[PDB]
Design a binder for this molecule. Structure first.
Ligand SMILES: [Mg+2]
Ligand SMILES: [Mg+2]
Ligand SMILES: [Mg+2]
Lengths: 204, 195, 212, 4, 244, 231, 233, 240, 235, 222, 4
C-alpha cells in the first residue's frame, strides 16, 4: 500500500545539441501481476511533452487535467503554451492538492519555439520544480536511472547519438527493477520534427 | 463476487462471471449474474465489496440510459469506459470510496470493432485483448498469453474461455459455482445458457 | 438467531426462532422475529435487535405511503430495495441486519429477497439467515423438493429451526411459522422447543445423540 | 444490546 | 423595503410575452449583422464590425468571431462583454465533455447547454437576460456540418443559412433567394459578402469593417480546419469576388 | 395612506399603521374576560361559531400546569405565541427546575412581537392575549397586544364590545379582588362581567368557555355541561 | 477531551437539623507540586446557597463566571430578585447539572465534581452532587475525591439516615466536618492545612469562615517508630 | 437569492402570472393527442414562416421521456426543455428504485407537480407550457393520454388539443370522436389526428409532424411522404 | 406593488382574503357527519366532454380512518395531501396508534400561513377533512388557507356553497342515518350544479369505523341517484 | 482519554398482574466501590398511569426519564389531553433510545402500567430501543440473579404437575398483588446477599386503575 | 518530498 510503487514505471529526459529526448517504459502492473504492456506515460500538448510516473489513475487524471488546461490556455492566449510556462502550470496544479496529493513524478520536456533553447524539468508529487541542464529521472527505478544518466551522459550530443545514450540509460535501469520494463518508447524532439521509436527490450 | 474474465476476439467481446455469492461459511446463492447492460452494445461485469458492486453498476446503468434517451444515441464503448473511470477516479478520494472493479465489453458500431476495457476501483483504465480481476488473472493471463490469437472466431473464444474456467476449477481454493457467459457483437448482447 | 424462508409449489414458508441474547446471557425466549408489513408482505429479523425492529417497522410506514400515493400494494422488489438503499446509506456506521422480505404480488408471484446491512440484495428460492443458518441449511437442503405439500413444507420449515435451536447455542425458545399464498400470509402458530423437541424425537425417531 |  | 425598486425581469405581459427578452432582441437588432452559410463541404461565418474608426487596431482585434474549440466557432450579435461571459462557459463545458468521455463535444449538446443557461435568466434569479444572439458554426462525426442560432429567450434552432443583428429581414430574403443545397464553400463565401454588401448601413463594404471565418475539411484527409481570416486575407477575398 | 405598505415605515405623525391594522383584527374578534383575586385567576371567553352546523372556535389555551391564556383575533397567531410560551415555560422547568414567572412570560411575548414590527418582510401578530397564572408571588393577569405592549391588571377584557365588561370590572374591582378561597364566586363575577358585552345573544352551554388557576388548582378549562352551573 | 492541569481536592458537606455545612481546603495542586495556596473553592450564590467545586481550577473559574452572570440575569426585569423570585439552591444546581451533562455529551467536559449546599425558601435543607459525567445524587452527607472514601464514613456515624438530621445540632455537625478535614490532611497527599467552611442555617443565614487551620494533630507517637521491622535504634 | 413572490392572488381571486402563462401556451403552435383502441397518436403543427430550416437537426416537437412514454407541448420552447429533462431524470430514477418503468399517470403527476411548484415558489415565474403525455404502462395494452398546464392541474383525455386555434380542433374532435368506438386501428387514429390538424394548419406539407406510440416501447415518427399520403387521401374524400 | 404578508385597514391579510375568492370559483364539495359515519361528495365539473371524468380525483384518502375532499385551485392541494399522509403515517410510527382527526387537521393548517418573503403565496384551495377516532367519534373539519379550521355537523364549499349551506341548515338533524346523508349530499349537489347530476360528473365517498374511508363506485352512486329521484317524486 | 460513560449500579424489576402492575428498584447509587447515596429513587411516576425506570448510567437514565416525561406533556398539548396508552409510550421510548443509536443511552429501561383493556403490562428496552411486552423482567446489575427466579416463580418454568410423569406443565395463572410483592421482596433480599451494588432500600410503585401507590422496605446496608 |  505505497501508491508510488503499485503500478510501477519510469520516465527519463535528456538535452542534446538543439534537441531534447524523453523516454518511458510501457509496464502497468498490480504489484507482482503484469496487466498491460501498452501503457504509455509520455503525453504532449502542442510541442510541450509531459512524462508521468506513479499511481496510474493519477497519471491518466493529470494527463486529462493538463489537456483541459492547455486547450483553454491556447483559446485565450491564441498560441501554444511554452515548456517554461507549462512547468509553472504543473507546479501550481500539484501544490493545489498539497494535503491530498496526486502520487506522481512528472517530467516536462520540449524546445522553446521563440528562443530555440532545449528545456527539461522534473517535479515531486507536491509540485516542487527540479530544473536541469543535463537530465531528469522519475519512477520506481529512479536510483538506477540516476546511476546510468550520471555516467553515460555528456553535453551537446547530436540527436542520433542522444537517442543511443537515453535508450541504454532506460533499458539497463529497467532490467534492474521488477516493476519497470515490458517495452519502452523514446521521443527525439528537434525544433520542427519529432521521431518516436519503440525499443526492443527483454520482456520479464 | 470474485471471478470476472473478458476475451476480445475478431468480431465480439466475451464476459465470463462467477455465479457464487458467499457470506461467511455459507454459499447463499449459486445463480448470481454479476453484469449490467449499460446500452444495447455495451456490457459491464463487476466484482468487489458487498453492496458497493450492484449500487455502483446500477448507478452507471442509470446514467448511460439517461444519456441514450437525451441524445437518442448510443455512447461508444470508449466513451462509456472514460465516464466509468472518471466516476471511480472521483470515488477513490471520497469519504467512502466504491470498492468495485469492472470489465466493460462493447461493440463500437461506427468502427465495427469489439473493445474490452479493464478498470480497477482506483480508476486505472486499460484496453486489452483479454482481461481479468482478482486472483483469476494469476492463472488466466499466462494461459491466454499462450493460447490467444487476435483473429479468433466467437466459437474459438468460447473454447479458449472453457480452458480458463477448467484451470480455475482445478487450482482455485474456493467453489465459485461456474460462470455466466455473455457475448457482445454487432447484433448486441446475448447469454450462453449451457456452459 | 435462525430464520429461514423457502419457495415451493404451495407458495412461501417462513420459520424463525424467538431467542434474543446479550453475549452468553439469554435475554428473551419470546421475541417476534417476523414483522407483518401488510397482508401480502412479511419481514424476518437477524442481527442487532434494535436495528432490525426499528428499520423494519419504518419499512412498513414507507410501504403504506407507497399504496396511498400509487393506489396499489408495493412490489416485494420495491419494498426490499427501500430497505437495502436505506442500510447502504448507513454502510460503515455499524448497522447489523440480516433480513428476508417475503411476499406475493400479481406481477411477481411469490418472491423472497435477502437484504443485509453491508448492502447485499439477492432474489432467491431458499435463504437461511442468522448464527444458526448452517444448521437450518443442513436439514432444509437435504429434504427440500419443489413438489412438497403445504403440510410437509410447514413441517420441514419447523424441523429446520428445531435443528438449529438444538445445536446453535444462540438459537431457540420457540418456532413461529408463516405460509404466504396468493391470498396473503397465514400464521401457523407458536411452537415451544421445550415440548416440540420431545414430540418430534418420539414421533420421528430422530435426535439419537440425546439421552431419551 | 440484544442480538437475534 | 427593496420591493419598490424591483423591475421584475422574469414576468409575463398580459399577452404572454417576456418583456426583458423582447427588449433584449430589440437591443440585438441594432448590433452589426452576422451571417452563417452552411455548404456541403464547409461553413462560412461573416460579420460586419460596428461603425469602425480609422485609428482602431484591426489585425489584433476580436469583436464578432470567437473559437469555442477546434471544431466549433460562434458569430456574436449584441453586448460583446455579455457574449464573452457565455463563451468562457461554453469553452469550459466543451473541455468538461472531452475530460469525461475522451470525445469532442457534439455541436447540439454545447448549443443546448448555452441555450439552457440563457433560459434560466428568463425564468428565475430576477437578473436581466444576456443581450446576445449567437450563430454556432461547428462539425461533429454524427451530423457533420451544423449551423445553429440562440437568442436571449434561450430558444435555439438549426439553419442552412441565417443572419442575426441588424437588417435580418432584408438579409434573410436575399439568402432565401440565392441559396441552394449543392452549394460549395467558395460559393457560400461569395453569397455571405454579397448579402452584407447590400444590407450594410455603410456607404461601401471594406476589409477593415469585416470579420470572416471558414470551417472546411480543407486540411489533409478526414480532419476539420478553422480559419479566422487575417485583414490581408479579407482584402484579397473582397477583390477576388469583385466588391472592391 | 402612503405609510401603511409595511411595518418598517413610520407615518409623518410617528404611527405604525400595519401594527394599528393588526390591533383592528382584535376588535373584530369575539369578547374574552380576565379577572383575579389574591388566591385565584379566571378567564371567561365567549366562543364564536361560523353557523349553527359549525363548532364554537376554542379561545382558551393551556401553557403549563400554572399558566395559560385566552385569545381574540387571528387564532393561528395565538397558536404560534402559545406554542412559544409552552417552550419558554418548559425551558424554565427542565434547565432551572423553576416554574416560569407570569411577569417574565409577558416580557418574552413583548420581545417576540416587537421583532416583527421593526424588520422588512415580516408582519405584526394579529391577536390579543389574556395570560392568567399562579406563581411564587400569587395570582396574576396579563393583557398582551401585538404592538408588544404587555400590561399586568386586576381585571380586563378584549374583543368586540369589550368596553362593557371592562367598565363593569372597573366598578366591581373592590368586590371581586377579595373573593379569596372561593373559585365558583370568582367565576360568577367573570360570567356577570362578560354578560355586559352581549347583544341579542345570551350565554348557552356550548357557547361559554371558562378557565381557572389558583393556589391548589392547576390551570383547567371548563366547556360543555361543566359550565351549565354558571348560566 | 481534556486533561485537568491545576486541581482542587476533596469538598465535604452534611445536613443538620436547621441547615447544611460545606468545607474545602484552599490549595491549587499542579500534579505533585502544591503550586497555589490562596485558592477559594467555596463560591456563595446569594445568601442561601454555597457551591463547592473540586477538579480543574480553570473550569472552576469558568463556573464562577457563569454563577456571577446567573445572579445578574435573574435581577433583570425582576422586582422580587431579593425576595420571592430570588435564586434557590435547587435552581442553581439544576442549571449546573444541565451544563455538566451537555458538556460531557459534546465530549468536552468541565473536569469538576460540584456540591451545591443551601436552604430553600420553605426552610428545607438542599444538598446535591454533580460531576463531569453529569451524574447527580443527594444524601445526608456528600463528599468528592478522597472525601468520598474517608470523610463520608465519619460523617455517616453522625447522620446515618434521614431520621438522624433533626437530632444533629450545628455544634455536633461542624465538629464532625472539622475532624474530617484533619483526617484528609493526614492521608491526602494533595491536601493543605488551610481551608474554608460555610454554614447555611434557615434562622441565622449564611456564615462564611475563611483562613481556618487543621489543629489538635497527633504526631507524638512518630518518635517511637524506628526502621521497618528488625531495627532497634 | 432572488425571493420576490411573482405568482400572487389578485382581488378577484386570480393568479395573473399563471393566467398569462396560459396566453403563452395559446400563442404556441397547435399540438393534438388522439388515443385509439390499441395506440396513441401525437400530432404537432410547425409554422411555415420558417423556410431554409434544417429539419435533420432542429429540435423535434415530440420528445421521448422513456422508451414507452412521449411528451409533446405547446408554448415556450426553452421552458419545455427544462420539464422534459426533469421528466427524463425522474424516469431513470424510478427504474433505479422501484425496478419498474414509470406509469404514464405517475410521469404526468410528476411533471404537473413541477409546474405547480413554480406557481408558489419565490423568485420564479410559472412554465409557459402545457404538455400532452402519452404512452403505455409496463406490461399493459390500455392506451394512456394525459394533459398538464402551467397551474399544475392534470387529467386523462380520450382525445385533446392545446396551443393556437386549439378551440377549433377541440370542436372538431368533440363531434368526430366516439367514446363507445375509438379508432380501431393505427391508420384510423392517424387519419382522425391529421384531419383535426387540417382544420387549422394551412398546407399538409412540412407543417404536420405525426408520432405513433404502440404497446411495449413501440414508438415511430412518420416521414413527409407517409403523412402526405393521409393529406392527399383526406382532400380527395372531402371534394363530395 | 405591495408586501405578500400585508394587513388591510380592516385588519385582514389581503392574500388570504383573495385566495378565499379563488375557492368560491372552485367546484362544489359537501360533507355531512352522522353517528353512523361521515359522507363526502364533490362536483367533478369536466371542462370538456372528451376529458375522462374518472381521472378527476377531488376526493382523496389520507389514512384508513381519514378522508379529504377539496375545492379551488386543486393542484395546490397535492402538497397538502402529501403532508397530511406523512403526518398520519409518521404519528403511527412514533406512537403505534391512529392519529386524531383534529390533530391531523391542525398539522395541515400549520402549512397554511407558512408563506411570505416558506412558499410565495397562500394555498388557493379549501379542504373538507372527514374521519373517525375512538375519542371524539365521527368528525368533519373545514380547513381554510387562513390557517383556521372549524368542526361542522355539515358543510358546503365552492361556487354553490352559500346556497347549499342554507339547505344543509334546514335538513341536518342529530339522528340522520348514513343512507339519509348520502341522498342529502346528492340532492343538494343536483340543486347547485350547472350541468345535470349523474354518476360521471359527481362522486360520493364515506368513512365508517368498521370499513374505513371508501370512495363509492360509479355503479353504487348511480343506484343512490335513482333512489333519490324516486323518493322526491313519491310526495 | 475522557470516558463519557459510568456505572451507577443498582437493579430494577417489573411484574404484571391481571388488573395491576409493579415496578420495583433498589435505592442504592454507587461508583466503583463507594456508595454515593443509600436513598436515590430511580422509579418515577411519569403520569397517565405509566411508571418508568432507566437503570445503568444514572446521568443517561435521568436524561431519558426527563425526555419521556416531557414527551407525555407535549402529547397532551398536541392531541387534546388524550391519555398516552402504555403501548404508545413504549413505541415513543424506542424512538428516544434509537435517536442516540451512534452515541447510546447506557441504561436498561422498564415501564409498567395498564393496557387499554385494563390488564397489567410491563415493557422492557435494550439501550438502543429494541422493546417487547412481558409478564416479567429484571434489569440492571443483579438481573442475571433475579430473572431465572422470576421464570420459575411467575411463569412456572421447569415446574410440572406432581405424578403426571413430567407430561402436564404447572398451569399459568395471574398472581395477587400480595403474592407479587412477596416475590419482589425475596428477589431483592436474595440479590442484596450476593451482589455488592444492590442493597440499602427497596422502593416499589404499584399501578392499579385507582392510580400509583408506593411501598418502601429496608435492605441490608453492607 | 524534495528537501533542502
Ligand atoms: Mg517478470
Ligand atoms: Mg487494472
Ligand atoms: Mg450488598
Amino acid at each position: 500500500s505505497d501508491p508510488s510503487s503499485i503500478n510501477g514505471g519510469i520516465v527519463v529526459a535528456m538535452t542534446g545539441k538543439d534537441c531534447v529526448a524523453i523516454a518511458c517504459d510501457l509496464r502497468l502492473g498490480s504489484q507482482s501481476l503484469g496487466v498491460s504492456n501498452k501503457f504509455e506515460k509520455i503525453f504532449h500538448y502542442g510541442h510541450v511533452f509531459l512524462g508521468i510516473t506513479g499511481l496510474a489513475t493519477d497519471v491518466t487524471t493529470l494527463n486529462e487535467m493538463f489537456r483541459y488546461k492547455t486547450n483553454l490556455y491556447k483559446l485565450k492566449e491564441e498560441r501554444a503554451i511554452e515548456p517554461e510556462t507549462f512547468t509553472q502550470l504543473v507546479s501550481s496544479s500539484l501544490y493545489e492538492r498539497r494535503f491530498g496529493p496526486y502520487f506522481v513524478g512528472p517530467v516536462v520536456a520540449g524546445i522553446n519555439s521563440k528562443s530555440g533553447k532545449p528545456f527539461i524539468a522534473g517535479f515531486d508529487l507536491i509540485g516542487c520544480i527540479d530544473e536541469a541542464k543535463d537530465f531528469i529521472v522519475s519512477g520506481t527505478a529512479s536510483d538506477q536511472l540516476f546511476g546510468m544518466c550520471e555516467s553515460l551522459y555528456e553535453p551537446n550530443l547530436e540527436p542520433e547519438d542522444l537517442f543511443e545514450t537515453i535508450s541504454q540509460a532506460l533499458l539497463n535501469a529497467a532490467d534492474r527493477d521488477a516493476l519497470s520494463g515490458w517495452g519502452a518508447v523514446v521521443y527525439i524532439i528537434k525544433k520542427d520534427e519529432v521521431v518516436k521509436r519503440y525499443l526492443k527490450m527483454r520482456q520479464d | 463476487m470474485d471471478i470476472i474474465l473478458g476475451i476480445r476476439v475478431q468480431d465480439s467481446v466475451i464476459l465470463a462471471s462467477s455465479k457464487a455469492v458467499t457470506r461467511g461459511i455459507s454459499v447463499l446463492k449459486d445463480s448470481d449474474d454479476k453484469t449490467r447492460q449499460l446500452s444495447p452494445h455495451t456490457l459491464m461485469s463487476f466484482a468487489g465489496e458487498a453492496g458497493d458492486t450492484v449500487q455502483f453498476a446500477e448507478y452507471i446503468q442509470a446514467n448511460i440510459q439517461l444519456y441514450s434517451i437525451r441524445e437518442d444515441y448510443e455512447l461508444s464503448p470508449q466513451a462509456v469506459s472514460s465516464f466509468v473511470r472518471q466516476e471511480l477516479a472521483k470515488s477513490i478520494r471520497s469519504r467512502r470510496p466504491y470498492q468495485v472493479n469492472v470489465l466493460i465489453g462493447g461493440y463500437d458500431k461506427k468502427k465495427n470493432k469489439p473493445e474490452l476495457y479493464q478498470i480497477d476501483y482506483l480508476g486505472t483504465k486499460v484496453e486489452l485483448p483479454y482481461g481479468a480481476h482478482g486472483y483469476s488473472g494469476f492463472y488466466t493471463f499466462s494461459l491466454l498469453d499462450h493460447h490467444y490469437r487476435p483473429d479468433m472466431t466467437t466459437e474459438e473464444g468460447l473454447d479458449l474461455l472453457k480452458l480458463c474456467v477448467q484451470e480455475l476449477e482445478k487450482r482455485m481454493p474456493m467453489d465459485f459455482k461456474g460462470v455466466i457467459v455473455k457475448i457482445v457483437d454487432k447484433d448486441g448482447i446475448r447469454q450462453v445458457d449451457d456452459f | 438467531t435462525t430464520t429461514l424462508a423457502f419457495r415451493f409449489q404451495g407458495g412461501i414458508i417462513v420459520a424463525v426462532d424467538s431467542r434474543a441474547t446479550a453475549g452468553n446471557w439469554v435475554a428473551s425466549q419470546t421475541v417476534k422475529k417476523v414483522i407483518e408489513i401488510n397482508p401480502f408482505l412479511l419481514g424476518t429479523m437477524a442481527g442487532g435487535a434494535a436495528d432490525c425492529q426499528f428499520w423494519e417497522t419504518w419499512l412498513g410506514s414507507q410501504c403504506r405511503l407507497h399504496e396511498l400515493r400509487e393506489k396499489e400494494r408495493i412490489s416485494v422488489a420495491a419494498a426490499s430495495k427501500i430497505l437495502s438503499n436505506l442500510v447502504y446509506q448507513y454502510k460503515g456506521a455499524g448497522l447489523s441486519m440480516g433480513t428476508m422480505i417475503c411476499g406475493y404480488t400479481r406481477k411477481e408471484g411469490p418472491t423472497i429477497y435477502y437484504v443485509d446491512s453491508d448492502g447485499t440484495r439477492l432474489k432467491g428460492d431458499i435463504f437461511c439467515v442468522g448464527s444458526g443458518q448452517t444448521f437450518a441449511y443442513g436439514v432444509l437442503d437435504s429434504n427440500y423438493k419443489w413438489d412438497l405439500s403445504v403440510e410437509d413444507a410447514l413441517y420441514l420449515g419447523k424441523r429446520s429451526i428445531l435443528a438449529a435451536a438444538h445445536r446453535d447455542a444462540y438459537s431457540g425458545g420457540s418456532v413461529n411459522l408463516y405460509h404466504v399464498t396468493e391470498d396473503g400470509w397465514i400464521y401457523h402458530g407458536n411452537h415451544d422447543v421445550g415440548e416440540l423437541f420431545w414430540k418430534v424425537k418420539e414421533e420421528e425417531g430422530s435426535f439419537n445423540n440425546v439421552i431419551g | 444490546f440484544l442480538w437475534x | 423595503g427593496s420591493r419598490r425598486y424591483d423591475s421584475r425581469t422574469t414576468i409575463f405581459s398580459p399577452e404572454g410575452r417576456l418583456y426583458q427578452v423582447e427588449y433584449a432582441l430589440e437591443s440585438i437588432s441594432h448590433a452589426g449583422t452576422a451571417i452563417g452559410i452552411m455548404a456541403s463541404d464547409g461553413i462560412v461565418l461573416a460579420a460586419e464590425r460596428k461603425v469602425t474608426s480609422t485609428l482602431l487596431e484591426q489585425d489584433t482585434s476580436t469583436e464578432k468571431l470567437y473559437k469555442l474549440n477546434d471544431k466549433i466557432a460562434v458569430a456574436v450579435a449584441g453586448l460583446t462583454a455579455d457574449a464573452e461571459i457565455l463563451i468562457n462557459t461554453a469553452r469550459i463545458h466543451a473541455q468538461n465533455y472531452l475530460k469525461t468521455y475522451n470525445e469532442d463535444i457534439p455541436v447540439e449538446i454545447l448549443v443546448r447547454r448555452l441555450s439552457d443557461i440563457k433560459q434560466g435568466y428568463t425564468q428565475h434569479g430576477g437578473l436581466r437576460p444576456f443581450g446576445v444572439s449567437f450563430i454556432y458554426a461547428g462539425y461533429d462525426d454524427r451530423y457533420g456540418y451544423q449551423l445553429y442560432t440562440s437568442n436571449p429567450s434561450g430558444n435555439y434552432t438549426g439553419w442552412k443559412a441565417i443572419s442575426v443583428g441588424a437588417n435580418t429581414s432584408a438579409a434573410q430574403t436575399l439568402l432565401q433567394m440565392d441559396y441552394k443545397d449543392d452549394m460549395k464553400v467558395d460559393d457560400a463565401i461569395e453569397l455571405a459578402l454579397k448579402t452584407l454588401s447590400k444590407t450594410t448601413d455603410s456607404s461601401a463594404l471594406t476589409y477593415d469593417r469585416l470579420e470572416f471565418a471558414t470551417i472546411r475539411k480543407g486540411a489533409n484527409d478526414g480532419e476539420v480546419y478553422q480559419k479566422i481570416f487575417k485583414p490581408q486575407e479579407i482584402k484579397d477575398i473582397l477583390v477576388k469576388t469583385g466588391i472592391t | 395612506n402612503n405609510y401603511d405598505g409595511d411595518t418598517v415605515t413610520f407615518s409623518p405623525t410617528g404611527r405604525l399603521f400595519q401594527v394599528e391594522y393588526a390591533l383592528e383584527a382584535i376588535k373584530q374578534g369575539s369578547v374574552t374576560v380576565g379577572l383575579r383575586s389574591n388566591t385565584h385567576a379566571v378567564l371567561v371567553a365567549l366562543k364564536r361559531n361560523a353557523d349553527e352546523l359549525s363548532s364554537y372556535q376554542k379561545k382558551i389555551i393551556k401553557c403549563d400546569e400554572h399558566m395559560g391564556l385566552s385569545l381574540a383575533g387571528l387564532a393561528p397567531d395565538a397558536r404560534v405565541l402559545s406554542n412559544y410560551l409552552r417552550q419558554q415555560c418548559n425551558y424554565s422547568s427542565l434547565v432551572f427546575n423553576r416554574k416560569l414567572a407570569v411577569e417574565r412570560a409577558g416580557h418574552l411575548l413583548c420581545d417576540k412581537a416587537q421583532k416583527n414590527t421593526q424588520s422588512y418582510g415580516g408582519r405584526p401578530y394579529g391577536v390579543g392575549l389574556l395570560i392568567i397564572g399562579y406563581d411564587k408571588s400569587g395570582a396574576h393577569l396579563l393583557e398582551f397586544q401585538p404592538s408588544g405592549n404587555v400590561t399586568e391588571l386586576y381585571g380586563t377584557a378584549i374583543g368586540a364590545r369589550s368596553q362593557g365588561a371592562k367598565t363593569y370590572l372597573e366598578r366591581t374591582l373592590d368586590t371581586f379582588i377579595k373573593i379569596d378561597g372561593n373559585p365558583d364566586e370568582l367565576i360568577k363575577a367573570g360570567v356577570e362581567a362578560i354578560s355586559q358585552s352581549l347583544r341579542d345573544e345570551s350565554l348557552t352551554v356550548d357557547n361559554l368557555s371558562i378557565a381557572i388557576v389558583g393556589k391548589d388548582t392547576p390551570f383547567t378549562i371548563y366547556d360543555g355541561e361543566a359550565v351549565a352551573k354558571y348560566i | 477531551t481534556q486533561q485537568p492541569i491545576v486541581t482542587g481536592t476533596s469538598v465535604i458537606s452534611m445536613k443538620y437539623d436547621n441547615g447544611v455545612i460545606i468545607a474545602a481546603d484552599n490549595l491549587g495542586s499542579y500534579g505533585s507540586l502544591l503550586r497555589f495556596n490562596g485558592v477559594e473553592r467555596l463560591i456563595p450564590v446569594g445568601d442561601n446557597t454555597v457551591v463547592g467545586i473540586s477538579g480543574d481550577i480553570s473550569d472552576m473559574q469558568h463556573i464562577e463566571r457563569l454563577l456571577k452572570d446567573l445572579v445578574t440575569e435573574n435581577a433583570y426585569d425582576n422586582p422580587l430578585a431579593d425576595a420571592e423570585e430570588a435564586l434557590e439552591p435547587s435552581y442553581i444546581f439544576e442549571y449546573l447539572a444541565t451544563v455538566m451533562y451537555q458538556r460531557r455529551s459534546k465530549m468536552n467536559p468541565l473536569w469538576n465534581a460540584i456540591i451545591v449546599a443551601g436552604v430553600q425558601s420553605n426552610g428545607d435543607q438542599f444538598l446535591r452532587y454533580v460531576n463531569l459525567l453529569g451524574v447527580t445524587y443527594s444524601s445526608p452527607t456528600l463528599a468528592t475525591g478522597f472525601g468520598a472514601h474517608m470523610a463520608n464514613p465519619l460523617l455517616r456515624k453522625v447522620v446515618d439516615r434521614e431520621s438522624d438530621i433533626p437530632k444533629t445540632t450545628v455544634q455536633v455537625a461542624e465538629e464532625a466536618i472539622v475532624n474530617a478535614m484533619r483526617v484528609l490532611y493526614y492521608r491526602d497527599a494533595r491536601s493543605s492545612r488551610n481551608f474554608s467552611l460555610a454554614i447555611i442555617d434557615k434562622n441565622t443565614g449564611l456564615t462564611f469562615k475563611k483562613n481556618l487551620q487543621v489543629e489538635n494533630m497527633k504526631w507524638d507517637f512518630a518518635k517511637d517508630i524506628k526502621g521497618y521491622g528488625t531495627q532497634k535504634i | 437569492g432572488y425571493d420576490r413572490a411573482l405568482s400572487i392572488f389578485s382581488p378577484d381571486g386570480h393568479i395573473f402570472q399563471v393566467e398569462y402563462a396560459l396566453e403563452a401556451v395559446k400563442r404556441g403552435t397547435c399540438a393534438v393527442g388522439v388515443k385509439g383502441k390499441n395506440c396513441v397518436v401525437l400530432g404537432c403543427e410547425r409554422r411555415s414562416t420558417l423556410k431554409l430550416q434544417d429539419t435533420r437537426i432542429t429540435p423535434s416537437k415530440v420528445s421521448k421521456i422513456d422508451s414507452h412514454v412521449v411528451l409533446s407541448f405547446s408554448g415556450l420552447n426553452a421552458d419545455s426543455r427544462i420539464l422534459i429533462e426533469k421528466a427524463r431524470v425522474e424516469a431513470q430514477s424510478h427504474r433505479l428504485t422501484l425496478e419498474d418503468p414509470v406509469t404514464v399517470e405517475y410521469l404526468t403527476r410528476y411533471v404537473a407537480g413541477v409546474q405547480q411548484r413554480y406557481t408558489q415558489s419565490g423568485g420564479v415565474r410559472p412554465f409557459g407550457v402545457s404538455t400532452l403525455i402519452a404512452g403505455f404502462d409496463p406490461r399493459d395494452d390500455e392506451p394512456k393520454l394525459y394533459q398538464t398546464e402551467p397551474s399544475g392541474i392534470y387529467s386523462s383525455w380520450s382525445a385533446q388539443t392545446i396551443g393556437r386555434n386549439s378551440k377549433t380542433v377541440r370542436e372538431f374532435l368533440e363531434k368526430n370522436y366516439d367514446r363507445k368506438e375509438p379508432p380501431a386501428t393505427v391508420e384510423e387514429c392517424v387519419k382522425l389526428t391529421v384531419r383535426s390538424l387540417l382544420e387549422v394548419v394551412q398546407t399538409g406539407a412540412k407543417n404536420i409532424e405525426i408520432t405513433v406510440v404502440k404497446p411495449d416501447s413501440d414508438i415511430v415518427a412518420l416521414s413527409s411522404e407517409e403523412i402526405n399520403q393521409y393529406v392527399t387521401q383526406i382532400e380527395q374524400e372531402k371534394q363530395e | 406593488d405591495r408586501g405578500v404578508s400585508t394587513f388591510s385597514p380592516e385588519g385582514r391579510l389581503f392574500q388570504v382574503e383573495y385566495s378565499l375568492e379563488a375557492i368560491k370559483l372552485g367546484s362544489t364539495a359537501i360533507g355531512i357527519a352522522t353517528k353512523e359515519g361521515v359522507v363526502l361528495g364533490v362536483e367533478k365539473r369536466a371542462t370538456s366532454p372528451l376529458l375522462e371524468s374518472d381521472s378527476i380525483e377531488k376526493i382523496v384518502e389520507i389514512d384508513r380512518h381519514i378522508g379529504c375532499a377539496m375545492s379551488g385551485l386543486t393542484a395546490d392541494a397535492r402538497s397538502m395531501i402529501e403532508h397530511a399522509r406523512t403526518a398520519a403515517v409518521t404519528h403511527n410510527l412514533y406512537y403505534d396508534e391512529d392519529i386524531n382527526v383534529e390533530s391531523l387537521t391542525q398539522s395541515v393548517c400549520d402549512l397554511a400561513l407558512r408563506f411570505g418573503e416558506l412558499m410565495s403565496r397562500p394555498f388557493g384551495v379549501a379542504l373538507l377533512i372527514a374521519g373517525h377516532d375512538a375519542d371524539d367519534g365521527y368528525q368533519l373539519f373545514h380547513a381554510e388557507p387562513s390557517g383556521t379550521f372549524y368542526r361542522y355537523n355539515a358543510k358546503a364549499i365552492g361556487s354553490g356553497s352559500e346556497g347549499a349551506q342554507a339547505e344543509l341548515l334546514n335538513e341536518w338533524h342529530s339522528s340522520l342515518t348514513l343512507k339519509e346523508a348520502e341522498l342529502l349530499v346528492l340532492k343538494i349537489l343536483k340543486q347547485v350544479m350547472e350541468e345535470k347530476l349523474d354518476e360521471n360528473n359527481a362522486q360520493l365517498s364515506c368513512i365508517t369505523k368498521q370499513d374505513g374511508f371508501k370512495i363509492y363506485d360509479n355503479e353504487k352512486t348511480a343506484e343512490l341517484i335513482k333512489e333519490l329521484k324516486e323518493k322526491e317524486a313519491a310526495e | 482519554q475522557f470516558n463519557p460513560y459510568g456505572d451507577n449500579g443498582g437493579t430494577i424489576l417489573g411484574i404484571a398482574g391481571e388488573d395491576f402492575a409493579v415496578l420495583a428498584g433498589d435505592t442504592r447509587n454507587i461508583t466503583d466501590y463507594s456508595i454515593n447515596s443509600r436513598y436515590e429513587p430511580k422509579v418515577f411516576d411519569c403520569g397517565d398511569n405509566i411508571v418508568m425506570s432507566a437503570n445503568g448510567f444514572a446521568a443517561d437514565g435521568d436524561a431519558l426519564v426527563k425526555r419521556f416525561k416531557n414527551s407525555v406533556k407535549w402529547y397532551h398539548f398536541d392531541h387534546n389531553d388524550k391519555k398516552l396508552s402504555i403501548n404508545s409510550a413504549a413505541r415513543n421510548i424506542q424512538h428516544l433510545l434509537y435517536g442516540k443509536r451512534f452515541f447510546p443511552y447506557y441504561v436498561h429501561t422498564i415501564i409498567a402500567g395498564l393496557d387499554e383493556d385494563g390488564k397489567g403490562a410491563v415493557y422492557s428496552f435494550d439501550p438502543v430501543g429494541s422493546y417487547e411486552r412481558e409478564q416479567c423482567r429484571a434489569g440492571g446489575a443483579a438481573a442475571s440473579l433475579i430473572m431465572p427466579f422470576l421464570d420459575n416463580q411467575v411463569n412456572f418454568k421447569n415446574q410440572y404437575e406432581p405424578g403426571t410423569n413430567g407430561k402436564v406443565k404447572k398451569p399459568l395463572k395471574y398472581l395477587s398483588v400480595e403474592e407479587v410483592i412477596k416475590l419482589v421482596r425475596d428477589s431483592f433480599t436474595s440479590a442484596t446477599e450476593r451482589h455488592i451494588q444492590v442493597g440499602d432500600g427497596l422502593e416499589i410503585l404499584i399501578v392499579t386503575k385507582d392510580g400509583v401507590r408506593k411501598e418502601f422496605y429496608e435492605l441490608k446496608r453492607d
